[PDB]
Every structure is written in structure tokens, then in C-alpha cells.
Design a protein around this ligand. Structure first.
Ligand SMILES: *[C@@H]1O[C@H](CO)[C@@H](O[C@@H]2O[C@H](CO)[C@@H](O)[C@H](O)[C@H]2NC(C)=O)[C@H](O)[C@H]1NC(C)=O
Ligand SMILES: *[C@@H]1O[C@H](CO)[C@@H](O[C@@H]2O[C@H](CO)[C@@H](O)[C@H](O)[C@H]2NC(C)=O)[C@H](O)[C@H]1NC(C)=O
Ligand SMILES: *[C@@H]1O[C@H](CO)[C@@H](O[C@@H]2O[C@H](CO)[C@@H](O)[C@H](O)[C@H]2NC(C)=O)[C@H](O)[C@H]1NC(C)=O
Ligand SMILES: *[C@@H]1O[C@H](CO)[C@@H](O[C@@H]2O[C@H](CO)[C@@H](O)[C@H](O)[C@H]2NC(C)=O)[C@H](O)[C@H]1NC(C)=O
Ligand SMILES: *[C@@H]1O[C@H](CO)[C@@H](O[C@@H]2O[C@H](CO)[C@@H](O)[C@H](O)[C@H]2NC(C)=O)[C@H](O)[C@H]1NC(C)=O
Ligand SMILES: *[C@@H]1O[C@H](CO)[C@@H](O[C@@H]2O[C@H](CO)[C@@H](O)[C@H](O)[C@H]2NC(C)=O)[C@H](O)[C@H]1NC(C)=O
Ligand SMILES: *[C@@H]1O[C@H](CO)[C@@H](O[C@@H]2O[C@H](CO)[C@@H](O)[C@H](O)[C@H]2NC(C)=O)[C@H](O)[C@H]1NC(C)=O
Ligand SMILES: *[C@@H]1O[C@H](CO)[C@@H](O[C@H]2O[C@H](CO)[C@@H](O)[C@H](O)[C@H]2NC(C)=O)[C@H](O)[C@H]1NC(C)=O
Ligand SMILES: *[C@@H]1O[C@H](CO)[C@@H](O[C@H]2O[C@H](CO)[C@@H](O)[C@H](O)[C@H]2NC(C)=O)[C@H](O)[C@H]1NC(C)=O
Ligand SMILES: N[C@H]1Cn2c(nc3cnccc32)C[C@@H]1c1cc(F)c(F)cc1F
Ligand SMILES: N[C@H]1Cn2c(nc3cnccc32)C[C@@H]1c1cc(F)c(F)cc1F
Ligand SMILES: *[C@@H]1O[C@H](CO)[C@@H](O)[C@H](O)[C@H]1NC(C)=O
Ligand SMILES: *[C@@H]1O[C@H](CO)[C@@H](O)[C@H](O)[C@H]1NC(C)=O
Ligand SMILES: *[C@@H]1O[C@H](CO)[C@@H](O)[C@H](O)[C@H]1NC(C)=O
Ligand SMILES: *[C@H]1O[C@H](CO)[C@@H](O)[C@H](O)[C@H]1NC(C)=O
Ligand code: NA
Lengths: 728, 728
């Protein structure tokens, strides 16, 4: 009798997915790490050489966290002393190694505690941020040029984002953008002077006698937001003038009338940059397209080139307005936008014409534009088989939009329904990454004839291992509610018997534009629960969920904590109707937005769920950050949406928790969903005399991701679910 | 069949103990609040009159928290807008009502947010502290004289204590001391300039968008302490034109050489004050006796009148050097000190002689000196029947120390073995308060022939109610360890059957000088556990416990977390061998110091305990306050006691928790034992992969005493214990 997939299997990673992470360094070569060597591969033929021997930095004296080769291949940037900050931010030390001289550079070193560093896109210039100011090095061994003097910790951020811009706008710490050949350096400056601070304790190692108070500028909903300015400096002038001028590009008048955000920066040509701005009320966005004026040294944005993007039903974009993809001449661009039927499709714009032309259409959506050549646009969508949870690569002929080829659909239709892609520098080659429903499969292809060159990684090692394991299966299907298809997945125990009644765990996220029903292969907690504990683990994408049109996505506009919550309850009712679910043993759990929905469900009075677990939940929208929250909720003012902000809190449902078993879990150093949010849930439950289970994680953040804390939380939750389901 | 004492009975106070809280106002009369009316009683005859009608303040407009009648009976101070601070500190608003003219004083009112107020001991002067400064009013309707001008929040404290002096030295917020007839006002001034601050979050009501950070000057072990100065002001020579002159009395040279504390202030006569100072290494204390010089207006403390009190085996005093009790002329005094056998007895001192004479002796201790006349000294001791956990009132004939009379031992030997006492102004009368083993009993007596005048309150109402309840019993007894007796108590289930096996919960405190085995009648959580759940609740007084001599008490000197922890394990081991204890079901619990011991016991690897609960535990001594911790531990420096500080932590025992069920509980707003302490425990257990149960209480402090949190904690703990013991 084959073993099952156990909790220790999951926690110890005994069954490991192999990846194939390559780095394109040109149109036909990529870098690959094998046995701590860096190998260079020829894409066409598959032959390789040692780029950098594993032993090169044995006497470096530091463990190297990561590396970055300069575009011209002359230098390598070595990252060490890595210290994580938020989701994307960190600080580190850096050395530069001269590849031709086979020597480490010892003069004019990048300082310690550097916040961000990037090569220019061509050559070997560097820009870096240190103590919140921008510096540029033209040559790796030569003195830096200081670009800004206003940097001030927690106050003025030059070339890097503050907390909210990092998390909600740019999904990145970096706020600088080199022009295509590296002449210009564009950057944003954030001013957080009047932004309130979140403060929480950090306990550190037990040696620390007094806890530290962490203080972060963080605008909660309706609070004072950071302000932003945008600048461009000519780096080619740096060695000729004592103090090169950063030229400001100001937001349009339609943005300056009130609070606003900078939400996109994309260079079009060597002398043309596009910027998108978003009103604090996030249903109106403006793109400016700005040209360098050689005679004046200024940047001018013609109103004839300004593009408006607005929504009447919701916010703009999935999580932000989409990025433009410019044709080589910079005179036109492609952008994903919601069409008249509410489906996101590719629109083609001339820079000085306001009406665009849709080049794709249908009741499905484009997920991303991946590459653009003179003859073809390459994009990912969920068109194939009308499955919103599948992903395939397509190629559209620019001279003939009727000519659309699916590049991945039929490669291995049984094994592979969810692709992402990695193109070489001028799209001569592409790596396809299949992530399910079978084992991930990595392959290489030539763009010239769309032929498969070779399999890079097929996970045959893991396949072999898993043959000895009673693995669960996955069902992906839909139910019809109010004449609309809503998709669900079930992780089903091995030897699933439809004539039996199984306990069911509803695994919930359900945030706006979320997707929890898909074709991705996962080895996770659900695998164990199904394989070992014979629990069905289900997920459902109801109103508010993504990739299915605006009618579904915008259904929760200004009304978080309503339809997406009800639809999870209704999903559980529907799963009972299916006949293989023990109605006495239905649980629900979720993390983050999923913790909020879980708590709302457990507090609803539905009687459907026996028990549930919320991990790091939102409990009240006024506690969460402005950019994310206001996107869906508008402002917490009597004139806008305060009534709904107050009506959608977990705390107001406290009395209903008498009907359920609840486990509430939060990390004490969560900078994102503050521990405050669960502190207020627990206090409300205490106040109405409701017993529940609790667990804090000392010094853990929103990920609760440290090795020991990760193992501890899943161990704790497993005991809780098993007790609830009367499982020995 | 009759009901049991249930968890709801404990939580809703179904069975209430009656008290008789009186306030002596003279040698012959006392005040007693009855039906919200203040009555005055004649002690000799027990007749009364209405002193102040309940309805006098019907239109007052505020809920009155408390009252204080001036010593001359002419005024009543009305306390309202009460806002708690720490254990003893609070602020309030005050009004004064003139009892003769039947009117509120509206002129020159005491300000809002007053920190401390006190009548002079004679007449009706007032001293109050507001915004950290001292003010005096000679008449309730006249303007105040500002005494000090240096008061500064969290920095300079005039006439009030800082956090550590409040909690650890004076057990009071007040640092003001009127002379016996009100001529002089003595006060201390604390300076916390370089004391580090503990910082923690306070979440407040749900409406508060950003948590507040509370910051309290709090010296952890080894940290910079507050400094202190002492002053005396003449309140009879205050002027409206000139600022008051305060006369400083400086500490002796033997204190000024390093860190020290002011630990006692006791007026001897109208012109003589005593102070005791304590070294930061709390085994050396010095009393100065200081006399007013009418010609210089200075206070001189003759060196011939200095009294040194030191310890070679531990610290000085039970929790601080004891208070002196001066004779009428103030030329001599009585003080409890540890004799050559290490038992605390009354010593008689002449103000200018070095040697004192012990007037009591034996293998038992004096608990307190209660009254002094020219003929008798009245004291409480545990001499009777050699029971260290019993308390009785004695008088000793000052002309013949062989003549000692027990005044309470034989009044009701079965019901009453634990007394406290309240004497009238010149000891003409005394109220005895019996608190166990039977129901509390309040009686009034006259000193001249020790007549038992009358019964004030016999709790006969409660007795009648309890007849219909299956109440537990209490066994008080001893075990021998190493030729020494150590006392324990057991709360035994109703109808206790010594041929049955009961589960046993060990209820622990075990701090230095603690006593958990006594003759006191209590209605508490243990009553419920025994009465309803049939659990034996045991407590044991081992090494380090009080009231049994320094051999026992000082056994843990410089070594907290050693013998007192081992002795609890040994007691349980012994209990576990008794015929009526189920050795498979032994649990341990404690709060505060008891939570530390519980945690150290559970991390000991003993195997004796199935489960335990730690509430607000200390986890590492370097996290607790200086005055308490260093008293027992010295300084956490390599040259002193750092090594023992480092190996007496809960965290180092984390691995040993693998074979026990542990519930760890802590209030997030604990200003005393910081949440930090439990935060470091949880992290240690996570780090070794030990599962446990946790509960935080949002915004609760060391008491976890709000009505809702108190009910919630005891409900949660009851579930945990019942689960542990397999109880339905
Ligand atoms: C992969 O092999 C190719 C072709 O064999 C290498 O490219 C050149 O090969 C020819 C002879 O076949 C010679 O001119 C040189 O030896 C090679 N020049 C280069 C580019 O170094 C190529 O080197 C191989 N690629 C890798 C990354 O190992
Ligand atoms: C960041 O924004 C703040 C405003 O919040 C600017 O601070 C003000 O500067 C002016 C001078 O121009 C002063 O008169 C005000 O007193 C300041 N106000 C506040 C609230 O501090 C600040 O100059 C901005 N910094 C940068 C570099 O843009
Ligand atoms: C380089 O030029 C910038 C921009 O003119 C200078 O920044 C100004 O510095 C002065 C005085 O130090 C301030 O009053 C201005 O508010 C600053 N403006 C900006 C945009 O930051 C900078 O000081 C110059 N650096 C050098 C070396 O001269
Ligand atoms: C990168 O692009 C920039 C901007 O177009 C080039 O700089 C210009 O070069 C032209 C010559 O063709 C001159 O007319 C201008 O004076 C330059 N403009 C600026 C703003 O400096 C630059 O030469 C390009 N770099 C490379 C390596 O090709
Ligand atoms: C204590 O506080 C109250 C309220 O602030 C004071 O009451 C006065 O009367 C009303 C509200 O009851 C306010 O408008 C006034 O500002 C208050 N003060 C004045 C000027 O009379 C009260 O005075 C305060 N008590 C003292 C002694 O300061
Ligand atoms: C309380 O005691 C003080 C101090 O002994 C008394 O003040 C003294 O009174 C006598 C007059 O009888 C004067 O000769 C002294 O000069 C006073 N001394 C000081 C220090 O002021 C005071 O009279 C007593 N008051 C009461 C209420 O009995
Ligand atoms: C008060 O206690 C201290 C600490 O126990 C005693 O001072 C010395 O402490 C150091 C280590 O901290 C040791 O090296 C010495 O052995 C201690 N002194 C002795 C006993 O010689 C100090 O002696 C105590 N004071 C009194 C009055 O007994
Ligand atoms: C208790 O009883 C005595 C009488 O036995 C009360 O009477 C004394 O005081 C009264 C007013 O203060 C006078 O009216 C009496 O004349 C006086 N009697 C004597 C001679 O002592 C006394 O007040 C009573 N006490 C109380 C508090 O009511
Ligand atoms: C309270 O104590 C502080 C010392 O902690 C006193 O300040 C002194 O120490 C300062 C450094 O903090 C020195 O700069 C000064 O010499 C000294 N005094 C001054 C001017 O601050 C402080 O005076 C004390 N306050 C009172 C009222 O006694
Ligand atoms: N802060 C948000 C940022 N975010 C999220 N999805 C994204 C997709 N793309 C960009 C930013 C994105 C959820 C994420 C997020 C949402 C929450 F509601 C929450 F409680 C905690 C979170 F981390
Ligand atoms: N801070 C201490 C003050 N204290 C204690 N007993 C006393 C007796 N007399 C004066 C102060 C006294 C225990 C008390 C105390 C001791 C502790 F170890 C603890 F963790 C928490 C506490 F509150
Ligand atoms: C980084 O820090 C270390 C330790 O302080 C130091 O030796 C080294 O010189 C630093 N590097 C730079 C570039 O300053
Ligand atoms: C943006 O949203 C607000 C609130 O729903 C609305 O009043 C306004 O008309 C919207 N603007 C656009 C461009 O639709
Ligand atoms: C009293 O002292 C304070 C503080 O030093 C001062 O401001 C005030 O003017 C003084 N008053 C008189 C009457 O001297
Ligand atoms: C260098 O990498 C590893 C040591 O980290 C070693 O196993 C490997 O054999 C080396 N590379 C080569 C030349 O294969
Ligand atoms: Na009597």
C-alpha cells in the first residue's frame, strides 16, 4: 500500500518541483546556474560553456545572494549582506567584478546599505539609491555623481518607492527608469511628510532588552497620502557639468486639481517617455507622452498625445492601468483595455489619435502582452477552450489581425493548459513554462519557425517519486448561477468515491480580480489534507473574481464584504447538493483577503460551516492602506462611502461567532495587514463572550514565511481542522 | 440533591462575601457607609447617627467614585472622573463640600486631572499634585500655594512616584508625607531623565484608525534608574508674594557613593522625621533621624542617630526595610528586623544607640506592628500552633517582655485562624477581621480589658446560602524535605473519597516571600474546579517562601528559577504518590511570578505534569524591572550575576516542552510584565517546533481584569484544563 502525501512531506519539501530559471543576456544566449557554476547556453544548438566557475568567489569572504551581469557583458554586480525589508524592498552590499581583467573592483565601491542598484540597459552605467538619494556611476571604478540632495529617511524618497507605492502601485522598490540606450535617467520622488505612521513592536533576538518600535509611513483609508514628482536627468552631461539639472515633468491639470498617483512610466524611444497618472478616485487615468526638446533642454507633453482611460462601472485596470507597448518608432502603442462588453483586449493606438482599434475580441481576456516585433505581437490569454483559469501564448500578425496562431495550446493539451513565457532580447527565441495541470514542463523554441528546439526540464525525477504516492486528483469545473458560469476546483482524495460523504474545506481568497480555480499543479497543504486526511479542499471564483469580464469583476465595486462573501457561502451550499459532502463537516479558511472573507462567512449566521481559520485577516477597511482599499471602496467619508466601510467590518458580526469554532492567527510584525486588525477582532469576540482559538507569531510579517514559523502554523492549523472533523 | 459551585457562580459573584469597612475618625468613633449614607458610630455603645445623607449629592451631576472626610469633620472631598493609571496611580477631578454650611465650594477649585490629593492629618489643609507639581491649600475655598515648579511629564515627579517607585518601593502613587499636626509637608522628587522607556501598542476602541504607542519610563534589570531627592516645606509660613522654600535633606555619604533608593519615610514627632535609604545592591540600608532646627530653619540628621540595617544572606526586609514605630516622645522606636536565627522579630531601638533589644523571639515571625501605647505594643504574628499560614493579634507588655497575651487566638479557634486588625486613633478600640478558615467575621473590641464588645458582620446570610451548595474543603498540612517542614494546602472536592483517584492542579506563585498555603477562606476559580469538576487544587510553599525565617526565604538569593521551581516539582511528585491522586492527570498553573515558575517547571523535563497554563509570565529576568529583580538577582553584569540571569530563562528550556500541553496567555497592554516576555517564549517554542496553545488579550494589562476579559480568560482556561483531564 503506497504511502500518502503527508504533512511532513509538505513541510520538509521531500517532493521537489524542478524549475528552469534562465537569464537571457542577448538574442541567442542565456545564463543558467548549475552546481553553483554559471553556465552560458547557446539557444540555437543547446551547447554551453562555463561563464563563471563556481569557485571564483571562494575567498570572497561573504556569501553571495545574487548577481547581475552588465548588458555589455563586461562586468558582474555581486549582491551580498542581503537584508529584506517589505515585499519587494531590501538593502545589500555590492561589489563589481571586472570579467575581462578577472578582478574585483576595490575603488569607489557602491556603499553599504544600498537600497537599489541597476545597470543601464546598454553598456555598463550604474544608477543606485543610498540614504534615499540617487547616484550614477558612468564607469564601475570611477566616482559617483550625486543626482539628488533631498533624500530623508521616512520622508523624501528619490528613485525608490515608499511603503504604499511599493506594495500597491509599482510592485517594486525601484522608482527609476533608464531610457533605452541609457542617455536619460527618469525617476520619481515621493514626499511622505504628512503621512501618518503605523507603529508596532519588534522583539528581535532574546538578547534585546527593550523591544524596538517600528515606525512606517503608511496611509490608511482616507488618510493623508504621499505626494509625488517626476524628473528626468541627462546622464551623458554628468562629466561636463558640476551639477546636472533634473528636469521636472509635471502632472496634467486634470490630476493637479486633487490627490493623485503616478501609476506607470514607460519609455517609448531615446527621446520620448510616457507616464500614466491616476486620480485618488481611481476611475480616471491620464497618459501623457512627452518629447525631449533639444533647443530648450525641456520635456514637453502635447495635449494631442494625451490619452484618457476611465471606468463607469469600477476602477481602471485589473490592479492599476495597463502598461503601453510601443512600436519601434514610438509613434504607436498597444495596450490592454476593457472593451465595450467589459472584456480586456488589446487596443492599438496612434500616439496623436484618441480613438484606438481593438485587435482582439471575444468573451475571454488578454492576460498580458509578452513581446512585440515589427511583424508580430505575442500575448497570453485564457481564450483556449473557454477556460478562464487556463493560459496560452498566441501570436497575432500585425499586417493581418485575422491571422492569430496559438503557439502553446496543442503542444501537450493533457499535461499543459497554463503557460507563461520568456523571450530572448529581440524575441528570436522563447522559453515556454507550463505549470499545469500535469507536472511543470519547460521547453525552448525558435520564433523564426515556431519549432520546439528541446525540452529543458520535464520533472521526470519527481514523476518517478510520485508514482509511489497516493496523490489526490483535481477537478476544475463550473456551476451556473443566475445564468452565469462560476468556476470551482476541488482537490479530491485518492480513490475518491462519489457514494461517500467527505469532509470539505473551502479554501478562500476571493479578493477583487482573484482567481482560485485554475489549471496549475500545486504541492501544498491541500495536497496533504486530501491525500492523508481524506478531506476535499474546494475553491470557488464568484462575483468580484478576475479574467472573466467586468460584469463579474466590478460586481463588488464600492461593496467589499458583500457578494464575494455570499458567493462563498452559496458555493458551499452547492457542493453539499453534489452528494459526496458531509454537511456536518464543512470548514472554511483563508489568508489575507481570504482571512477577511473567512471571518465574514463565519460571522454571517449561515449555519453552513462548523469551523474556520483566518490568517492575518483584514477586519475593518479603514485599517487597510489607501491605494488598495479606496480603489474598490472610494473614501470613508459621509459624502462618499463611509456607511459601507462601517457596515462591512468583521467586529460587527461578533455575536454570530457563538455558532462556530474559530481560529485566529496573525504575525506581530505584519507591516501590511497590521496586527491591530486581529487585535480588534479578538477584543470584539471577548466583549460578547465568544470563545475561540488564537495564535500570534512573534516578529513574523504578512507571509508568516520563516522556516520555523511556516512549519509551526501549518502544524497548528492541521490539528485544528482534524479536531473539527473528528479525525484521529 | 444540591447544586455545586459553578464557573458562572465564580464569574457572576453569586455568593458574595460581606465586609465591614470602617474608618476611624477619633479614639471613640468611626465612619461607616450604609445604603449610600455615611453614618458615624460610637465604638463603646454601637449607637449611630447619620453623618451625611445619600441624597445630598442628588443634583451633583457626576458619578462620585469615592469620598474623603477632613480629619476635623468640616469638609468632604468628592472624587469623580476617575481614570486608572498603574496598580495604585490614577487621576481624578475633585470637589469639596462644606459640611457646616451645607454647600459645594465653587472658588479656587482643585483642578481636573489631579494626580494625588490628601488632607493634613489634623484640621483641613490639603496638598495635591497636578501636572507633576505640588500645591497646598490652607483653606478649601482659598487659592493654592504652588510648592514646586519643576514638574515635567515622564521626567520630573514632585510628590508622586514614577512607575518603578509606585510598583516596587512605596506601593502608592503618593510621595507626600504630612507631619503629625500638619505643620510640615515632606516630599520626594524623582528624576527619570535617563531611564529608558518601554513602548507598546494600545489599540483602543475600534474607531481609532492608528494604534497609539504607550511610552513609560521603566528601568529593566541593570538599566539606568531614576534618581531621588527629599524635601520638607513649612506650610505654616507660606506667602502669596514669595515662592515657598523647600529644605533638602540629602542621603548619607554611604548612599551617595553610588545608585540608591529612598525606601521609607516616617515622621517621629512634630519636628523629627526618619528616612531610610537603600543601596542599589539591596543588602545595605541606612536610617537617618532628622530634627528641625528652629534657629536656622534647617533639618539636621546627627550621625550618632544613624541606624544601619544589613543582610549577609540576602536582601533587607521582606520586600523593603520595615517601617519604624516611634514612641510618643520620639526618643525610641520599635522595628521588625531579622534576628541572628533569621526570624523576623520586634527590636527596640534608642534613637542614639547602635544596639537594639529584641522584645520577641522564637521560630515564627512577627508579620506587622499594629499599635503602640506607653504600656503595650500590639502586633500580628504566626506564632499560634506553629502554623506559618495563620495570623493572630498579640500584645506585649513593654515593662515585662515575658508577658505576651494572644488577643485573638481563642475567640473562635475552629472558624478563625487568620486575623487582621484596625485600631482607633489612640488604640482605645480595635476591630478584628477574621478571614478564615470559616466565613469572615468582623468584631469590635476595647483595649482596656480586651472586652469583645460586639459582632459587626458575621456573614450569616452567605452561610445560609452556602448550606444549599456542595462546597469543597481545604486541607492545610506539611511535608518534610531535608529535615525541614514545608506547608501545602489542598482544595478538595465535596464528598472527598480517599479511595478514589482525582486529577490534581498545582496552583503556583512561589515568588520570594510568597505564601500560598494558608487558613484564608476564598471563593475563586479553584472553588469551582473542586466543587463542580472534582479536581484537587493544591498549592505548596517551598524554598524562597515567606514568614518562616531567612533560612527558607533567602535560599533563592541570587538564584531565582532554581530551588522554588525544583520544590514545586518535588511537591507534585509527593502528591502524585498519594493514594487519592491520579498521576496521569497532574497539571500546573500560575500567573505573573507563578507563570514564570509554571513555565520553568514545564520546561524542566520532569515528566510529572501533563499540561500547564502560564498567565502573564516573566520569561527572562533582564526583561523585568530593576528594583524587584536586582533585589533577588544582583546586577546582570559579568562581575556580578550575569551567568545566572542567562541560564534562568524560560526560552532555554523550549525543547523540553515537547512532552507537555502548554497554554500561554498575556495582555497586550501589560505595563508590568511586558508582552515581550511571552512573545519571546512563543518564538523559542516555534524555533524548536513545539506545538502549544496561545491567547492574547487586546489592551488588557497585568490584571486581565476588565469584566469581559476576566470571564473570557477563566472560560478559556477551564476548557483547557477539562480537555487535559478528559472531563466532559
Ligand atoms: C556552441 O557551439 C558553437 C558552434 O560550435 C560555438 O560557436 C563558435 O564555434 C565555431 C566553430 O564551430 C568557432 O568559431 C568558435 O569556437 C565558437 N565561437 C564562439 C561564439 O565562442 C559556441 O562557442 C558554443 N557556445 C557556447 C556558449 O558554448
Ligand atoms: C515635502 O512636503 C512638505 C509639505 O508637507 C514640504 O514641507 C514644507 O516646506 C515649506 C517650504 O517650501 C515650509 O514652509 C513648510 O513649513 C513645510 N511644511 C511641512 C508640513 O513641513 C517639503 O518642502 C517637501 N519636500 C520636498 C523635498 O519636496
Ligand atoms: C545641485 O542642484 C540642486 C538643484 O538646484 C541643488 O538643490 C537645491 O539646493 C539648495 C541649497 O542647498 C536648496 O535651497 C534647494 O531647495 C535645492 N533644490 C532641490 C531641487 O533639491 C543642490 O544643492 C545642488 N548640489 C550642489 C552640489 O550644488
Ligand atoms: C542615445 O540616444 C540619445 C538621444 O537620442 C543620443 O544623444 C543624441 O545624439 C544625437 C546625435 O545623433 C545628438 O543630436 C544629440 O545632441 C544627443 N542628444 C542628447 C540629449 O544627448 C545618444 O547619442 C544615443 N547614444 C548612443 C550610444 O547611441
Ligand atoms: C474641569 O473640566 C470641566 C470641563 O472642561 C470644567 O467645566 C467648565 O464648564 C464647561 C463644561 O462643564 C466648560 O465650557 C468650561 O470651559 C469649563 N471651565 C470653566 C472656564 O469654568 C471645569 O472648570 C474643570 N474644573 C476645574 C477646576 O478646572
Ligand atoms: C504643630 O507643631 C509645630 C512644630 O512644633 C508647632 O509650631 C511651633 O509652635 C510654637 C508655639 O506654640 C512656636 O514657638 C514654634 O516656633 C513653632 N514651630 C514651627 C516650626 O513653626 C505648631 O504650633 C503645632 N500646631 C498645632 C496644630 O498644634
Ligand atoms: C551585598 O551583596 C553583594 C553581592 O552578593 C556582596 O558583595 C560581594 O559580591 C561580589 C560579587 O558580586 C563577591 O565577589 C563578594 O564575595 C561579595 N562580598 C563578600 C561577601 O565579600 C556584599 O558583601 C553584600 N553586602 C553585605 C552587607 O553583606
Ligand atoms: C451615642 O450615645 C450617646 C449617649 O449615650 C450620645 O450622646 C452624647 O452626645 C450627644 C450629641 O453629641 C448629646 O446629645 C448627649 O448629651 C451626649 N451624651 C453624653 C452624656 O455623653 C452620642 O452622641 C451617641 N453617638 C452617636 C454617634 O450617635
Ligand atoms: C534630572 O536629572 C538630569 C540628569 O539625568 C539633570 O540634568 C543634568 O544632566 C544633564 C544631561 O542630561 C547635564 O547637561 C546637566 O549638567 C544637568 N542639568 C541640566 C541643566 O539638565 C537635571 O538637571 C535633573 N533635573 C532636575 C530638575 O533635578
Ligand atoms: N496589498 C495588495 C497588493 N496586491 C494584491 N494583489 C495584487 C496584484 N497586483 C499588484 C498588487 C497586488 C493583494 C495585496 C493584499 C490585499 C489585501 F486585501 C490584503 F489584506 C493584503 C494584501 F497583501
Ligand atoms: N512587581 C512586584 C511588586 N510586589 C510583589 N509583591 C509585593 C509585596 N509588597 C510590595 C510590592 C510587591 C509582586 C510583584 C510582581 C512580581 C513579579 F515577579 C511579576 F512578574 C509581577 C509582579 F507584579
Ligand atoms: C561595508 O562595511 C564593512 C564593515 O563595516 C567595511 O569593512 C567595508 O569597508 C564596507 N564597504 C564599503 C564599500 O564601505
Ligand atoms: C468615479 O467614481 C465616483 C464614485 O462612484 C463617481 O461619482 C464618478 O462619476 C466616477 N467617475 C467616472 C469617470 O466615472
Ligand atoms: C516662582 O518660581 C518660578 C519658577 O522659577 C518663577 O517663574 C516665578 O516667577 C516665581 N514667582 C515669584 C513670586 O518669585
Ligand atoms: C563546482 O561546483 C561544485 C562545488 O560547489 C562541484 O560539485 C562541481 O563539480 C564544480 N563544477 C564542475 C567543474 O563540474
Ligand atoms: Na459582646
Amino acid at each position: 500500500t503506497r504511502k500518502t502525501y503527508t504533512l511532513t512531506d509538505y513541510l520538509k519539501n521531500t517532493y521537489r518541483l524542478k524549475l528552469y530559471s534562465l537569464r537571457w543576456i542577448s538574442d541567442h544566449e542565456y545564463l543558467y546556474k548549475q552546481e553553483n557554476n554559471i553556465l552560458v547556453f547557446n539557444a540555437e544548438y543547446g551547447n554551453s560553456s562555463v561563464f563563471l566557475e563556481n569557485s571564483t568567489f571562494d575567498e570572497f569572504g561573504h556569501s553571495i545572494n545574487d548577481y547581475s551581469i552588465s548588458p555589455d557583458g563586461q562586468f558582474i554586480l555581486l549582491e551580498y549582506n542581503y537584508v529584506k525589508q517589505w515585499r519587494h524592498s531590501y538593502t545589500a552590499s555590492y561589489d563589481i567584478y571586472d570579467l575581462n581583467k578577472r578582478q574585483l573592483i576595490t575603488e569607489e565601491r557602491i556603499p553599504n546599505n544600498t537600497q537599489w542598484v541597476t545597470w543601464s540597459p546598454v553598456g555598463h552605467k550604474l544608477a543606485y539609491v543610498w540614504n534615499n538619494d540617487i547616484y550614477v556611476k558612468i564607469e564601475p571604478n570611477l566616482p559617483s555623481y550625486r543626482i539628488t540632495w533631498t533624500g530623508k529617511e521616512d520622508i523624501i524618497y528619490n528613485g525608490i518607492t515608499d511603503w504604499v507605492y511599493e506594495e500597491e502601485v509599482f510592485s517594486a522598490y525601484s522608482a527609476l527608469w533608464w531610457s533605452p540606450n541609457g542617455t536619460f535617467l527618469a525617476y520619481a520622488q515621493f514626499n511622505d511628510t504628512e503621512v501618518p505612521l503605523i507603529e508596532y513592536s519588534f522583539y528581535s533576538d532574546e538578547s534585546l532588552q527593550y523591544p524596538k518600535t517600528v515606525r512606517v509611513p503608511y496611509p490608511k483609508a482616507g488618510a493623508v497620502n504621499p505626494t509625488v514628482k517626476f524628473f528626468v536627468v541627462n546622464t551623458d552631461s554628468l562629466s561636463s557639468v558640476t551639477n546636472a539639472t533634473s528636469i521636472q515633468i509635471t502632472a496634467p491639470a486634470s490630476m493637479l486639481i486633487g490627490d493623485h498617483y503616478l501609476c506607470d512610466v514607460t519609455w517609448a524611444t531615446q527621446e520620448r517617455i510616457s507616464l500614466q497618472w491616476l486620480r485618488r478616485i481611481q476611475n480616471y487615468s491620464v497618459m501623457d507622452i512627452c518629447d525631449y526638446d533639444e533647443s530648450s533642454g525641456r520635456w514637453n507633453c502635447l495635449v494631442a498625445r494625451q490619452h484618457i482611460e476611465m471606468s463607469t462601472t469600477g476602477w481602471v485596470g485589473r490592479f492599476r492601468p495597463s502598461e503601453p507597448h510601443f512600436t519601434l518608432d514610438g509613434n504607436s502603442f498597444y495596450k490592454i483595455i476593457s472593451n465595450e462588453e467589459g472584456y480586456r483586449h488589446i487596443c492599438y493606438f496612434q500616439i496623436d489619435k484618441k480613438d484606438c482599434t481593438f485587435i482582439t475580441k471575444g468573451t475571454w481576456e488578454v492576460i498580458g502582452i509578452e513581446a512585440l516585433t515589427s511583424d508580430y505581437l505575442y500575448y497570453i490569454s485564457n481564450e483556449y477552450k473557454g477556460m478562464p483559469g487556463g493560459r496560452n501564448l498566441y501570436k497575432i500578425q500585425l499586417s493581418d489581425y485575422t491571422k492569430v496562431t496559438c503557439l502553446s495550446c496543442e503542444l501537450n493539451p493533457e499535461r499543459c493548459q497554463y503557460y507563461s513565457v520568456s523571450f530572448s532580447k529581440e524575441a528570436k527565441y522563447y522559453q515556454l513554462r507550463c505549470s499545469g495541470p500535469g507536472l511543470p514542463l519547460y521547453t525552448l523554441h525558435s520564433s523564426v519557425n515556431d519549432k520546439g528546439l528541446r525540452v529543458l526540464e520535464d520533472n521526470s525525477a519527481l514523476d518517478k517519486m510520485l508514482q509511489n504516492v497516493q496523490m489526490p486528483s483535481k477537478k476544475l469545473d463550473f456551476i451556473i448561477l443566475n445564468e452565469t458560469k462560476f468556476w470551482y476546483q476541488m482537490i479530491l482524495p485518492p480513490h475518491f468515491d462519489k457514494s461517500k460523504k467527505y469532509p470539505l474545506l473551502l479554501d478562500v481568497y476571493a479578493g477583487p480580480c482573484s482567481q482560485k480555480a485554475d489549471t496549475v499543479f500545486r504541492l501544498n497543504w491541500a495536497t496533504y489534507l486530501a491525500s492523508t486526511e481524506n478531506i476535499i479542499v474546494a475553491s470557488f471564483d464568484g462575483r468580484g473574481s478576475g479574467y472573466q469580464g467586468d460584469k463579474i469583476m466590478h460586481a463588488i465595486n464600492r461593496r467589499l464584504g458583500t457578494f464575494e462573501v455570499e458567493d462563498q457561502i452559496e458555493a458551499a451550499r452547492q457542493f453539499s447538493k453534489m452528494g459526496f459532502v458531509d454537511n456536518k463537516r464543512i470548514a472554511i479558511w483563508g489568508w489575507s483577503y481570504g482571512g477577511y472573507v473567512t471571518s465574514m462567512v463565519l460571522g454571517s449566521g449561515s449555519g453552513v460551516f462548523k469551523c474556520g481559520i483566518a490568517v492575518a485577516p483584514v477586519s475593518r477597511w479603514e485599517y487597510y492602506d489607501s491605494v488598495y482599499t479606496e480603489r474598490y471602496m472610494g473614501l470613508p467619508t459621509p459624502e462618499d462611502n463611509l456607511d459601507h466601510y462601517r457596515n462591512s467590518t468583521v467586529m460587527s458580526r461578533a455575536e454570530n461567532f457563538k455558532q462556530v469554532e474559530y481560529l485566529l492567527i496573525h504575525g506581530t510584525a505584519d507591516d501590511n495587514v497590521h496586527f491591530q486588525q486581529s487585535a480588534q477582532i479578538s477584543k470584539a469576540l471577548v466583549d460578547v463572550g465568544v470563545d475561540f482559538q488564537a495564535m500570534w507569531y512573534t516578529d513574523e510579517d504578512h507571509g508568516i514565511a520563516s522556516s520555523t514559523a511556516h512549519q509551526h502554523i501549518y502544524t497548528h492549523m492541521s490539528h485544528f481542522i482534524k479536531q473539527c472533523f473528528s479525525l484521529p
